[PDB]
Design a protein around this nucleic acid. Structure first.
Ligand code: FES
Ligand SMILES: [K+]
Ligand SMILES: [Mg+2]
Ligand SMILES: [Mg+2]
Ligand SMILES: [Mg+2]
Ligand SMILES: [Mg+2]
Ligand SMILES: [Mg+2]
Ligand SMILES: [Mg+2]
Ligand SMILES: [Mg+2]
Ligand SMILES: [Mg+2]
Ligand SMILES: [Mg+2]
Ligand SMILES: [Mg+2]
Ligand SMILES: [Mg+2]
Ligand SMILES: [Mg+2]
Ligand SMILES: [Mg+2]
Ligand SMILES: [Mg+2]
Ligand SMILES: [Mg+2]
Ligand SMILES: [Mg+2]
Ligand SMILES: [Mg+2]
Ligand SMILES: [Mg+2]
Ligand SMILES: [Mg+2]
Ligand SMILES: [Mg+2]
Ligand SMILES: [Mg+2]
Ligand SMILES: [Mg+2]
Ligand SMILES: [Mg+2]
Ligand SMILES: [Mg+2]
Ligand SMILES: [Mg+2]
Ligand SMILES: [Mg+2]
Ligand SMILES: [Mg+2]
Ligand SMILES: [Mg+2]
Ligand SMILES: [Mg+2]
Ligand SMILES: [Mg+2]
Ligand SMILES: [Mg+2]
Ligand SMILES: [Mg+2]
Ligand SMILES: [Mg+2]
Ligand SMILES: [Mg+2]
Ligand SMILES: [Mg+2]
Lengths: 71, 109, 168, 107
RNA sequence: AGUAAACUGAGAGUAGAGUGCUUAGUUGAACAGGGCCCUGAAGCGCGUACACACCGCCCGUCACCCUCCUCAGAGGAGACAAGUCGUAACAUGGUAAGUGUACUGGAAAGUGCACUUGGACGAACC
RNA sequence: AUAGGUUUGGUCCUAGCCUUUCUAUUAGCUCUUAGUAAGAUUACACAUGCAAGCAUCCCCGUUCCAGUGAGUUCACCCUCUAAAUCACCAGAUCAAAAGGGACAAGCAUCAAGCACGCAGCAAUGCAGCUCAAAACGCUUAGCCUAGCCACACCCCCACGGGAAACAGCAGUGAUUAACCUUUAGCAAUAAACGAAAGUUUAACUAAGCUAUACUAACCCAGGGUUGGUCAAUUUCGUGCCAGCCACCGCGGUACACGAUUAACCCAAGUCAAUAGAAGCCGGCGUAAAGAGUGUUUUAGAUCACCCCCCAAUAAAGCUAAAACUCACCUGAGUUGUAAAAAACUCAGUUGACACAAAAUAGACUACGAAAGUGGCUUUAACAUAUCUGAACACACAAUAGCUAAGACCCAAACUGGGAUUAGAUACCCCACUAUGCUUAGCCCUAAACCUCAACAGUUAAUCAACAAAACUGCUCGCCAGAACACUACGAGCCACAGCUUAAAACUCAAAGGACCUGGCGGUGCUUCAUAUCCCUCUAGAGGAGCCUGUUCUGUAAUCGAUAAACCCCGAUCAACCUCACCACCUCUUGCUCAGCCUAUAUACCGCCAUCUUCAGCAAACCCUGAUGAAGGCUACAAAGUAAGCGCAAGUACCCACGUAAAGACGUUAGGUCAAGGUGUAGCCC
């Protein structure tokens, strides 16, 4: 069998790698912002949990850790 | 370009025709063009608002109302509704808009 | 072609071919059998062939199977009254098991046909209604009666459009 | 697939037929925003008459104007039905002649 | 091989017109043995994305216009569509092709490591 | 489905798309009558008129009928038992609230919900319950139609608030492609009321409007189509333009476009658009698909009873060959290749010496689940007496890569230099680094492919093609046109230019897999070229002048050939003529029952080049391939036979040699419309 499909996939992959290399910095910024929004959404969901539970403040001795931050 | 798109809404067909004649007496197309998108009888309608939005036009309502729904939609879509109860008041407002597009050389007479 | 050995087992005709309709007291049927052992071949073929028929004919009966739990195959029927019926199915072919269960707990053909006649009692020939429930929709369909206007127009005299005209 | 697999997966599911340019409607009312011509894809060669119209749904689409000659100017109201013009890519509508401001084709 | 070469006539056509053309004749040679890079020919094979048939096909960059998507404007895809720089792929595509991964480069792509044959190694000895 | 059209130079397979059928809405064009049936697009806003009275006052009804489909698993079955009817009760019928069960569609890129349970009389205790057999969550939908559910302007409700309610009938504005009367009577049935005669009722009945449909009639037929699928076109006009098409396609001097003639199909309709009706037992080596590997629970199956060693892996240790380095001493050179440059003064012998890699064995085919494992020794060690079983977890996963520390002989991305090149960010040469190695973590990807899943079984009636013969049973995973897409988003991850899962929008009628023929190959082997491809022999051209042809320049001033296969060629020939060219002048039924050297050699005949300095071309048969395109040979012969044409033979010249002549089918749309004729088109003062 010929390798036309493999060639098409190879060209697409090469172009995608080149694009990611070209715009990595912008992708870095966007991904960091996305992770911040993810952390905020998780915090909001946990707050919804313990508020619907009827508590005005999170359970005593609890502080939502930063699960999405690299550090 | 220096073009004014106008929708005309009147209370009666005679009023609409009179406003149309006043519009046709326009002669200063060179300095600014006047285009009549749609004329009709009745209160400002969603169709009129949509035409105004599409052509960046202004709705001129002669002795017609525009419900709060229409006003809210016009604000949302950037359309401008101008309800006038007097023919010469409306003509003055039209001339002012023409000048804003530019005073307009067209004299209604 | 239909997947599986004996694909006929998955045809509504085969399921309806069953003849074991349990009396109203039977609620649960537990079939214990052994996957191996020549003396349990009858029970094996019973589970493989007839259980579909029994379940189809007695939908509300809970039939539950148990594999290689006891040295012998057997059926146990739990009846509504609280009675338990044990049937030793070792050495019996599946057809023998079907005959036995029909005889000891199956409704008799007399009862079945009487119930069918009772069901026939529901649909009355003389009733007029939609085709789903009655033979005829309207008495217009009976020959000799005044036919439906949509097919045979009524005389001008018998229509209100002209009765009013005459009255005027 | 085995019987157990088919039973687990249930009957096959038809995705909801994606609506065409008419949003699953026989016709739409549009306002002729502009008129122009398009070169059909090769090998066909021509200047197909098309017009950009803002449909009633608020969408802006391109409608091919059939017939020998037209007079569709700006702001005119037309009726537009489905049926893609084969030689034009993306022009997936047609103005219905004789309706609203699009008069029939002159003989 | 009476060939090459040299030399000497005649004819066609014109009123006249060629160093041209056709043709008769004289003298009259040397090599003729090795090979397959190229031209080619044949046989038997191999490959083939070409079928307007390699003057083929086809990739990518760049700028040439519309549809859609993501997007704070810009990118991505597709289509349309003639160009610019190369010839990356299809023949051993002229460095076999490709997968994963890493670095590098207008651009296809190049190279490094391992893996695949969806290449071959011409199928007795030589 | 009784199927058809469509991928290609062609065949076969898969596959999407479309056609044919039947409905419904809208639109274009058109339309005679009668009966019946059905009839806002919108849970947006409403002018107006009516839609609930009855009855000796109380009571009863206005909670019904009627309406709409916003919402939406309250409809169905069982248990119990309200309200209502049975003049009172009777239990009977009917049917609420409550409790138990059943109950739509898609999305898993919604996989965790976060108290969703139990016990106890209570106190209180236990920490449980739902969920990959789809919990929770998002979006969509009135439904299961003698009818049922839900809503009644909105705030789910409706005290309260927003506000002033047609989703009752008629009707209206807005909106949409969507558009029925601002009719009559309670005469019939139903409902309310009354003891009853009776009264009321936009329920209903009878009418009004509408080809939306059915029926019947009509003594006035329109719509669509006519290249194929698919029934059916004459002449003109246009000339890749105008335009047409459901798919394939048509239009460059038209049975596909416009007009006309005719014909075909249906017919008071026709059919443009849209929607719906037909959606899984088929497959996974190459078309999409067996997921890189192994092991569960819940389960499923019947294949369960019948029935030693070699190269696995981890650890520790060791080293034979060859390197490097250092010592000797000897020499001026070494490396580098197709040839060089660059590079080093290091090179050779002998000896000492690794944390690198493991010739021969191996022509063996074993170990491991896969990745992988081939120097030696030792320790430990290679799960399951039944098979399947992870996007649903656990443990592995070559090479590459990151992190931190060591080793570094050699090799080596990148880098630098030397070449080569039009360029050379490559291929070739040199040097060197990350890296390959050891340790501890990460990373979790491969053409992880034997592209062929596990288990059990059969070789019988085969089998699209190729490949590694065809299948049966069972199970799990996966696939449903191409591309967008090893993508974006979402999610998870020690990953930060990443990996796994993974769509959609726009676009197309194909994409694709396997073959057959042809060409092509800087394609292989073998054999040849006989003035032939190279060397070899002779004579030349390429250097000078001239003759002459052509291209260019010039002119008012031809045309044709113009790679081989043009270029002293058409011409075995131009001062006038020839002459078809240019300038000027002149003639118009004209030498011709006109004329035209005007365009078209890409309409042709005619005569030719070309391979051909070939030998094949072949009708008519037969067979092989499963009766596909296609192919058809072996002489100790195996499916070919072939008429005819060509070669050959025959013939001219001086032989039987040689030279001529001859040279088929075709190739270059090869030359000639200017030998002549000739179709088409064009000019006719
Ligand atoms: S159905 Fe009986 S009269 Fe019409
Ligand atoms: K010379
Ligand atoms: Mg691509
Ligand atoms: Mg190449
Ligand atoms: Mg190459
Ligand atoms: Mg490579
Ligand atoms: Mg490099
Ligand atoms: Mg109609
Ligand atoms: Mg709804
Ligand atoms: Mg997503
Ligand atoms: Mg309302
Ligand atoms: Mg409410
Ligand atoms: Mg109403
Ligand atoms: Mg209205
Ligand atoms: Mg309608
Ligand atoms: Mg013609
Ligand atoms: Mg594939
Ligand atoms: Mg297992
Ligand atoms: Mg797995
Ligand atoms: Mg690894
Ligand atoms: Mg190093
Ligand atoms: Mg491997
Ligand atoms: Mg990848
Ligand atoms: Mg990704
Ligand atoms: Mg992401
Ligand atoms: Mg020669
Ligand atoms: Mg010269
Ligand atoms: Mg010439
Ligand atoms: Mg020429
Ligand atoms: Mg002369
Ligand atoms: Mg002359
Ligand atoms: Mg002439
Ligand atoms: Mg020719
Ligand atoms: Mg001969
Ligand atoms: Mg000859
Ligand atoms: Mg030619
Ligand atoms: Mg020529």
């Amino acid at each position: 069998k010929n390798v036309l499909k493999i060639r098409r996939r190879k060209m697409n992959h090469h172009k995608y790698r080149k694009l990611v290399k070209k715009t990595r910095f912008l992708r870095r910024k966007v991904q960091e912002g996305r992770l911040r929004r993810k952390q905020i959404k998780f915090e909001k969901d946990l707050r919804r949990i313990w508020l619907k539970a009827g508590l005005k403040e999170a359970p005593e001795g609890w502080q939502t850790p930063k699960i999405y931050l690299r550090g | 370009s220096n073009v004014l798109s106008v929708i005309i809404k009147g209370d009666v067909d005679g009023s609409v025709e009179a406003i149309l004649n006043i519009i046709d007496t326009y002669d200063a197309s060179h300095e600014c063009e006047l285009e009549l998108v749609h004329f009709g009888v009745g209160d400002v309608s969603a169709n009129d608002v949509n035409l105004a939005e599409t052509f960046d036009g202004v709705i001129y309502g002669f002795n017609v109302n525009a419900g709060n729904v229409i006003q809210q939609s016009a604000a949302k879509k950037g359309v401008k509704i101008k309800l006038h109860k007097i023919i010469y008041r409306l003509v003055e407002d039209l001339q002012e808009e023409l000048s804003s597009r530019l005073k307009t050389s067209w004299d209604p007479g | 072609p239909m997947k599986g050995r004996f694909p006929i087992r998955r045809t509504l005709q085969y399921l309806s071919q069953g003849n074991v309709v349990f009396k109203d007291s039977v609620k649960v049927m537990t079939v214990n059998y052994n996957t191996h052992g020549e003396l349990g071949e009858g029970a094996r073929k019973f589970v493989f062939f007839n259980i579909p028929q029994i379940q189809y004919k007695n939908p509300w009966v809970q039939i539950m199977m148990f594999k290689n739990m006891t040295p012998s195959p057997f059926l146990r029927f739990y009846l509504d009254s609280g009675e338990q019926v044990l049937v030793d199915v070792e050495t019996k072919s599946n057809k023998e098991i079907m005959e036995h269960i029909r005889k000891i707990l199956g409704k008799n053909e007399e009862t079945l046909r009487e119930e069918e006649e009772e069901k026939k009692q529901l649909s009355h020939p003389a009733n007029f209604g939609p085709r789903k429930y009655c033979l005829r929709e309207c008495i217009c369909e009976v020959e000799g009666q005044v036919p439906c206007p949509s097919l045979v127009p009524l005389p001008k005299e018998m229509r209100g459009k002209y009765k009013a005209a005459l009255k005027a | 697939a085995t019987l157990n697999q088919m039973h687990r997966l249930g009957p096959p599911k038809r995705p909801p037929r994606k609506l065409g340019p008419t949003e699953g409607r026989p016709q739409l009312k549009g306002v002729v925003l502009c008129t122009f011509t398009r070169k059909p894809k090769k090998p066909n060669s021509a200047n197909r008459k098309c017009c950009r119209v803002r449909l009633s749904t608020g969408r802006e689409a391109v409608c091919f104007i059939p017939g020998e000659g037209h007079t569709l100017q700006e702001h005119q109201i037309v009726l537009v039905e489905g049926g893609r013009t084969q030689d034009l890519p993306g022009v997936k509508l047609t103005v219905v002649r004789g309706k609203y401001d699009c008069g029939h084709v002159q003989k």
